[PDB]
Design a protein around this ligand. Structure first.
Ligand code: FAD
Ligand code: FAD
Ligand code: BVN
Ligand code: BVN
Lengths: 488, 488
């Protein structure tokens, strides 16, 4: 009844790698972690540290940080910074160069974690399930290939994460995704970003910031308005400010045919039936769970709609000893969630006294050219699920953009309460510093905060943030139905 | 028993001007507001809108916004922004030019407020008290001079604010203050900022950002460490990062003699007994209340230490009908406070049901080269006033500054709880976006938040802010006395 390892993790992911460390250090279990790579190389993109550290949130943010400098360089002129204006385009070489260095140094950090840690062991391969207690480790994703190790274990945790969705049409093979986008040769001049997910809109921002001289970027969404699930007024204001920063947004539009020209570039045929050339199209259609190879069938774990592992509120699967977390499960699909989900699993199983991860009122951000910070319910949902909701709102252009001449940069806020009790159901912010503000906002909404607590708090004179504490008069209400004013 | 005006305000200040409007609009009282000026001119520096709008927080912030671009221009290089490096100094002309335009347009905003508003009247002069119900309006601060109006009123509100303190030594007349600093001719090459108040440290930052090529800035504090009353580790880390950004800090040092040279520049003699030349010395010694001219004696209002008006928790003075708010009172000396103090006065007097302004746990910021955001108690105080306090701390250098090569920019946080109950007594942050974060932090501490609520909240993956929700292990404690660990 004693296995070689107490716990095998399939994926050194933001969520998985956390679980492994927590088990091994606080509780001193014999832990094994499987992944596909040491460092952040292209062929198989993810690695030790997960999709976040290697081909997501971290490098993404560094490139977003880079692309911002376009606007800041431009903006400084107002405050009296005179310099080379003509032909000031940026150097994609030196960005990705210094980017890789950073990501590389984190992978290097993880190597000497495993070395230094008590009974935490890394195993480079492709984790499959043989049964409830046996984890195969092949050298190919191919179930035919050579077998490097056979890990015998009391528990399994599936933290394999997710993979880019692919639009099924002729020409599809010529496109790229977030993954390939991180290791592009040069900055694309003529760029198309297909889709309207937070990935598309960030990267549109990036390529637009790092486009060469003469170049442009188009965004191309299937539907009406980009960013489904966000506050519709933020969504509208963002599409506007992407307009004003160069990103040519197109809606109710989607490619069908792509074919590659003699110069290397790609020719594209659309829904409307127009034709344009781009140096790359990037498919940001979303992300499917990554359970396609693990053989969950063979161990008696079962998967619902399109691969997602069936779990409960304590992350246990169809089998009692097997568990799953983060993007594979399809619950939320963010890092600090997957990290919580994995940390709760350690308190659950190996820590005796259990706990479930709190999926409600999770604050998150979009790192778009002017970024979004959101936490909790929209109008769309709150008006439906609650009796009488009040909607507060206040857009404003900060003092400084009168000088900088980027007068398009309207900072927006909009609180969504339940009028019955005054409880803040959701806060939605668009503008510079929104992701930093929303974090501490999301602490307030965790404590069930009410609009009375917001405006009664004193405020800092010069920050965008203080306009949270100056919202008293609701702009309008939804009264158990559609939009209205305050009836008896 | 019917006066011409219900309420006379002495000072169209951030606090006073608010009171006037609130009375006049929600409650429809006959209101009069006195001030010294329409627009933001030098001779008498303040104006319609107050010290904040005219010669403080607003222009201050615009210049701080300007000076930041020095570092951002520099920093962009890492991310691949190649341009004119050599001799890229800024243009003080175009800053102050565009600054004034902005401030001017706010003064212009206030003119057409008074015009548009029901029974809100502006009166340009120097408000004195003749008695409990009579307000003189002279054309000089001089009590001898001509009398422009005599305002008859049921109530008076003294919101005259504050004025720069002056170090009493030979040469003092050659120096400047925040006030004169806003309308300087050119950027000073060789600058001295005397004092260690938040004003000094901001302006040091400004002149340092806007110094010409070859120039420098010295800060000169009377005592050991700049910024008394802030968290001593933030204070130390800031002095370090001001070092790294060029500001040569000097402590236990203070001038005695100043004398003006044949080229216009000023020669300075110090405590240690060294001699240096500066184009200006700016005295940021602090700010005294501005009750020196009003003749409070004559109306039976009385003033304590160095002019501050004696008030209670509902802002009433030594006389029942007279009140006072903001910097004149000496309670807190910030805008959004003075605004609350003035808004509560309207609920108090004219609104029937009264209220007192909540002076505890007021969040505020310092807009220094890397800024500070603080709310509530330090260790220094909490260890003294509470039984068993725990101190949490976590400094870190953001992902991006590995690329930008400003590796001095360490983001610091340090929560100070009471270990008995886990209540967050104070949060202290140093680094970029600290003032935006602290606002929503100060909402949490208004709701009496506890460190358990902080770390239990989920977190955004890429922001400095999320390191609030990752602090569990206290770094150390004070156990009813000095610094220690956890004894039975
Ligand atoms: C472009 C992009 C930007 C993002 N930005 C953000 C953001 O700003 N904020 C945020 O909160 N979230 C962001 N995310 C989401 C975040 O990356 C994930 O939600 C998070 O990494 C999920 O963690 P996880 O443990 O489920 O799996 P992951 O962290 O995805 O790790 C999965 C690991 O498992 C490995 N693996 C796969 N198959 C196998 C196998 N058979 N055997 C062994 N190992 C295997 C992979 O190589 C990988 O290293 C972003 C994602 C992307 C793609
Ligand atoms: C350089 C600087 C930077 C600052 N930065 C910040 C910041 O970032 N954040 C923050 O919260 N606070 C800041 N402050 C503080 C803020 O300016 C004040 O606390 C706030 O303005 C106080 O409001 P008040 O109503 O008491 O008086 P004030 O707003 O100071 O207004 C006083 C008005 O009364 C007028 N007056 C004077 N004497 C008379 C008289 N006899 N008759 C009629 N009128 C008269 C003056 O002309 C003036 O317009 C700063 C101050 C300075 C000097
Ligand atoms: C019956 C119609 N409902 C969808 C099944 C519409 C539900 O409400 C919407 O308005 C809605 C919701 C989601 C939605 N997709 C999310 C956007 C996205 O990232 C996306 C973009 C393109 C594709 N695509 O494969 O073309 C898919 C998702 C589009 C519209
Ligand atoms: C008995 C000594 N106490 C002061 C009466 C010291 C109390 O604790 C201090 O360490 C302390 C507190 C405040 C303090 N001054 C505030 C700093 C400031 O802005 C200032 C700078 C210069 C002068 N000055 O007139 O030289 C005054 C204030 C200095 C030291």
């Amino acid at each position: 009844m004693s296995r070689a390892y107490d716990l095998v993790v399939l994926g050194a992911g933001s969520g998985g790698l956390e679980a492994g460390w927590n088990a091994a250090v606080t509780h001193k279990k014999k832990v094994a972690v499987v992944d596909v790579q040491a460092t952040h190389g292209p062929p198989l993109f993810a690695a030790l540290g997960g999709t976040c550290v290697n081909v997501g949130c971290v490098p993404k943010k560094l490139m977003v940080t880079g692309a911002q400098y376009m606007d800041l360089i431009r903006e400084s002129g107002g405050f009296g910074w005179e310099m080379d204006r003509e032909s000031l385009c940026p150097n994609w070489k030196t960005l990705i160069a210094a980017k890789n260095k950073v990501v590389n140094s984190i992978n290097e950090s993880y190597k000497s974690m495993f070395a230094d840690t008590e009974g935490l062991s890394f195993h480079m391969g492709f984790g499959a399930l043989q049964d409830a207690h046996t984890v195969v480790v092949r050298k190919s994703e191919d179930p035919h290939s050579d077998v490097l190790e056979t890990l015998d274990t009391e528990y399994i945790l599936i933290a394999t994460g997710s993979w880019p969705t692919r639009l099924g049409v002729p020409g599809d093979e010529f496109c790229i995704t977030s993954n390939e986008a991180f290791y592009l040769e040069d900055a694309p001049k003529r760029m198309l970003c297909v889709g309207g997910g937070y990935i598309a809109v960030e990267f549109a921002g990036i390529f637009n910031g790092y486009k060469p001289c003469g170049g442009y970027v188009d965004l191309c969404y299937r539907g009406d308005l980009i960013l489904r699930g966000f506050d519709t007024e933020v969504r509208k204001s963002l599409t506007k400010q992407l307009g004003a920063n160069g990103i040519r947004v197109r809606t109710n539009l989607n490619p069908t045919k792509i074919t590659k020209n003699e110069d290397g570039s790609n020719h594209v045929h659309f829904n409307d039936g127009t034709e344009e050339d781009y140096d790359q199209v990037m498919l940001a259609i979303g992300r499917v769970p990554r359970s396609q190879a693990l053989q969950l069938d063979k161990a008696g774990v079962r998967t619902g709609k399109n691969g997602a592992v069936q779990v409960d509120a304590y992350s246990k699967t169809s089998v009692d000893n097997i568990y799953a977390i983060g993007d594979v499960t399809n619950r939320v699909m963010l890092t600090p969630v997957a990290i919580n989900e994995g940390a709760a699993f350690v308190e659950t199983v190996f820590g005796g006294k259990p706990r479930a991860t709190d999926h409600t009122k999770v604050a998150c951000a979009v790192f778009s050219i002017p970024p979004i910070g959101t936490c909790g319910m929209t109008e769309e949902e709150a008006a439906k699920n609650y009796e009488t909701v009040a909607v507060y709102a206040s857009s404003f252009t900060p003092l400084m953009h009168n000088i900088s001449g980027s007068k398009h940069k309207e900072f927006m806020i909009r609180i969504i309460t339940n009028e019955s009790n005054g409880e803040v159901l959701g806060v939605h912010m668009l503008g510079d510093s929104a992701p930093e503000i929303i974090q501490s906002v999301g602490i307030c909404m965790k404590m069930g905060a009410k609009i009375s607590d917001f405006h009664s708090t004193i405020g800092v004179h010069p920050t965008s943030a203080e306009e949270l504490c100056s919202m008293r008069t609701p702009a309008y209400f939804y009264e158990s139905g559609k939009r209205v004013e305050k009836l008896s």
